[PDB]
């Protein structure tokens, strides 16, 4: 579970494990795929997707997911998590605002991202309905058994941990997690690399002038922009994405039927939608003479139909056609 710098972490820029990168309000189904720097899913070892492992300290905390909250302008709905990554059904929102509850603390993370949800169709809803026609939307999956893409996930760079740099009663005293690789020296001249167990520091004294580092590359990370490079190498760790964008047919929009009214080679149409509906036509002469107008306000319109025919498209309701001799 990677940890990075959340931008407006409740107060201001903290370093949250759930630091939000790559917000994708690019689908249609009320859904956003998000990456936390935290890797929830199974535990550290082997069990139960519905548990929760973020970083506390240098360490993980692979425990229950109890009170996740993604949210935006309104509280979102989770869809599924896998890896670093969560899918959640959100409404539109100027921002994105994520957070669980460990239990002692709220411990959330928030971010800017322009979000919208147009459904696919000539109706510009704000939200998916219960009914209407199905038609080919873009949307992310529920599932994990997924390989359609993979993002590079090589090592972490080092990280700071000044909990290490204690004092040896006059000298600044570094320690190690588990024998991990601590990269160490101070502004003064003393040990210059640091690949060690718990060292002391002969020369410097102040904690604030030393290299508290953790080369702990036993587990790779996501290659966040808010990661410091592991300077050594491009290690392996090509790793999939679960939530591929797929060609789901969203349960989708439908605009109320029109009121057809006859006139001489002319369609008066008293019209009354639910939401802004893009109407348009095609006078089937080799003179096309089409028309487009989003209609949200109910409006009686007109169409000079010709002899050979016109067609009529009340939103994603199917196209009509008309003989006006």
């Amino acid at each position: 579970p990677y940890i990075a710098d959340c931008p407006n972490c409740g107060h201001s820029r903290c370093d949250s494990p759930i630091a939000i990168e790559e917000v994708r309000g690019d689908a249609h189904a009320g859904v956003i795929r998000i990456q936390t720097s935290a890797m929830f899913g199974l535990k550290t070892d082997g069990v139960d997707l519905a548990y929760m492992s973020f970083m506390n300290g240098k360490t993980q905390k692979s425990i229950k997911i109890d009170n996740l909250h993604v949210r935006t302008s309104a509280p979102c709905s989770l869809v599924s998590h896998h890896g670093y990554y969560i899918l959640a059904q959100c409404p539109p929102g100027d921002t994105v605002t994520v957070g669980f509850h460990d239990g002692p603390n709220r411990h959330t993370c928030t971010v800017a991202h322009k979000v919208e949800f147009r459904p696919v169709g000539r109706e510009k809803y704000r939200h998916p309905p219960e009914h209407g026609v199905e038609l080919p939307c873009n949307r992310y999956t529920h599932k994990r058994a997924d390989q359609g893409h993979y993002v590079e996930m090589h090592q972490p760079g080092l990280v700071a941990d000044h909990s290490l740099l204690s004092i040896h009663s006059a000298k600044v005293k570094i320690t190690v997690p588990s024998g991990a690789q601590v990269k160490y020296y101070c502004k003064c001249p003393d040990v210059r690399e640091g690949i060690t167990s718990s060292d002391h520091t002969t020369t410097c004294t102040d904690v604030k002038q030393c290299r508290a580092y953790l080369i702990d590359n036993k587990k790779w990370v996501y290659n966040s922009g808010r990661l410091p490079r592991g300077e050594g190498d491009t290690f392996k760790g090509k790793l999939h994405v679960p939530f591929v964008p797929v060609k789901a047919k969203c349960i989708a929009t439908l605009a109320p039927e029109p009121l057809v009214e006859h006139k001489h080679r002319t369609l008066i149409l008293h019209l009354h939608p639910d939401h802004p509906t893009l109407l348009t036509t095609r006078s089937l002469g080799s003179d096309a003479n089409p028309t487009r107008q989003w209609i949200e306000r109910p409006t009686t319109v007109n169409f000079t139909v010709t002899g050979e025919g016109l067609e009529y498209t009340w939103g994603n309701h199917p196209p009509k056609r008309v003989w006006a001799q």
Partner: antibody, heavy 117, light 110 residues
Framework: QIQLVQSGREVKNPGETVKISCKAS????????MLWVKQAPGKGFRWMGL????????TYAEEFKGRFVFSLEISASTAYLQINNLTNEDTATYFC??????????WGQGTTLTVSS | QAVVTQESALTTSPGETVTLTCRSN?????????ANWVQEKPDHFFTGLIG???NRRSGVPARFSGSLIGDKAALTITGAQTEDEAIYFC?????????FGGGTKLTVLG
């Protein structure tokens, strides 16, 4: 079912190298990596690292990065511990172990080294 | 850079319920520490009992169960048996390495 049978115990004078084998039985080698643990005479149990029997990458505990080298005869379901430039305080017993079920489920018999001139 | 601590020795009688604990020096033990319990019988004989806090290895009697009690991992032997007299070690995961406890010598009447 699962048997990890280890090599027999060696004697080696300071400075030498030793290769301790761990031959695995009962599981598919490849889906379960190997833990190497040192139980030193007095001191108790210590994790020496883990080897990804799939890719082949080893993790060493910091105490063990250096003279210790994990490798595997993949092909024969063997994992091996090699301790080079043997120090006298390396006398102890080394166990191979299978990492599974969010911990370790099976331990080997142990191979005891007595570093001594 | 973490120290797992366990009771030194515990004595019980056949038929009793006994609890061994595993404490971490850094903080409460949690499910992301994947507490493991290992038993050492004489002859350098190791077997794994529980993993990932409460998963019992296969073929380990049911009298053995693991859990988190308070801020520590615990192993309960319900109906201890004479055969359970051995050294029990706990192991805790810390994001990149394993730390083993000192082990608890358990003595069971029989």
């Amino acid at each position: 079912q699962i048997q990890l049978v280890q090599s027999g115990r060696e004697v080696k004078n300071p400075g030498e190298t030793v290769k301790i084998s761990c031959k695995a039985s009962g599981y598919t080698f490849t889906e379960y990596p190997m833990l190497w643990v040192k139980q030193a005479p007095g001191k108790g149990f210590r994790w020496m690292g883990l080897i990804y029997t799939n890719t082949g990458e080893p993790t060493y505990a910091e105490e063990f990065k250096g003279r210790f080298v994990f490798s595997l005869e993949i092909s024969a379901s063997t994992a091996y511990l090699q301790i080079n430039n043997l120090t006298n305080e390396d006398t102890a017993t080394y166990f191979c172990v299978r990492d599974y079920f969010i911990s370790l489920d099976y331990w080997g018999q142990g191979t005891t080294l007595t570093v001594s001139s | 850079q973490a120290v797992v601590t366990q009771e030194s020795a515990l004595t019980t009688s056949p038929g009793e319920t006994v609890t061994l604990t595993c404490r971490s020096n850094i903080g409460a033990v949690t499910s992301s520490n994947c507490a493991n319990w290992v038993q050492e019988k004489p002859d350098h004989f190791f077997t794994g009992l529980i993993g990932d806090t409460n998963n019992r290895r296969s073929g380990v009697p049911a009298r053995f169960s693991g859990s988190l009690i308070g801020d520590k991992a615990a192993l309960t032997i319900t109906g201890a048996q004479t055969e359970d007299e051995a050294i029990y070690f706990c192991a805790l995961w810390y994001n990149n390495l394993w730390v083993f406890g000192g082990g608890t010598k358990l003595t069971v009447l029989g």
